[PDB]
Each structure stands twice: as C-alpha cells, then as structure tokens.
Symmetry: C2
C-alpha cells in the first residue's frame, strides 16, 4: 500500500548529509537522489539508526570513487565502528 | 553561566527559514544573524514554538520592508493566526 511521502524527516537527512566532512564532493555527486533515499529510510526504519547511516556511507563511497576525499563524520554516537588496537577508522586513505 | 552553543538545532532553523515562501528576499537581507538568533531561541524555549516563529516573523518583516514580497508560511500547525469571520491572514498585502 502506497505509504505517505516521508517528507517530515527531510531536514534531518539534509543536515546530516551536507555536513563539513563532505565538502569537496558537492560538485562530483548530486544530492537529490541520495536524500530522497534517506526519506524512506528514516521512516521505514524506526528506532535504531542502522538504516539511515547506510546511505551516507554510499554517498561517501561515491565521493571517494569520483576522485574527492571526504573527512571524518562517524562519531561515537553516529554509527561508530571499532577495530582492534589503536587502528583508527578513517575515510580516503591508501590501502597500502 | 555560558551555555552550550545550540548548534544541534541548526538544521531545523536553516530548513524552516529558507523555505520557498522566502524566495525573493535571499538577496535583500542576510541570513547568518537571524539563524544565529534562532539557535538560542530553539534551545532556550523548550516545548511550545513561541520563540522560533518570532524570529522568522522578523525575517519576513525585513523581507517586506526592503521591497520584497514573501509567501505564506504559517500553516495550521506552524504558529497559525486567527481573525474573526472569513478574514484570511496573509503577508505582503495592501492595508488600503
């Protein structure tokens, strides 16, 4: 059944996606599709934020693949990740 | 005591203020000062939205005074206003 257009969470998605760490990709990748995707993601996925931060991850991957370099956005309260030792989770660093 | 910078609601103020109704005044009046004021208003006035819709009212008054004509933004759930009879509330209409 056609659910309501989840436009009540548009501000949250726009604020989260268009942060400082995503500066040098605003001209590489568009924005409308990825935020429209966040629209349904936010309402279709109540409770834990395991379903919204999986889009901005795709936005960052597209950012990195085009040629840009994003900053760090994952905080201890925004879908953090853990690795053993003092290894630091980052974006846009050489795998070598 | 100096309170925390109420930047956690910056997205809310930015979204609500930069709507389509305020189209032809983005070039007349600045944006930073009024949004900065909205920052404290949103966090210093919990519960009812009697402080947030007092700043955008000033933004609209400036929009109209400079020469622009803003659109309607007051909805039935966004600080509505009532007048007796079928007196419709509007912005930028002649008092004559």
């Amino acid at each position: 059944v056609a659910p309501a257009s989840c436009s009540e969470h548009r501000a949250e998605c726009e604020r989260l996606l268009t942060a400082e760490a995503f500066a040098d990709c605003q001209d590489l990748v568009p924005l409308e599709p990825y935020l429209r995707a966040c629209q349904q993601d936010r309402c279709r996925c109540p409770g834990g934020d395991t379903c919204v931060c999986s889009t901005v991850a795709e936005f960052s991957r597209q950012c990195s693949h085009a040629g840009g370099r994003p900053g760090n956005w994952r905080t201890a309260t925004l879908c953090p990740k853990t690795c053993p030792g003092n290894l630091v989770y980052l974006e846009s660093g050489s795998p070598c």
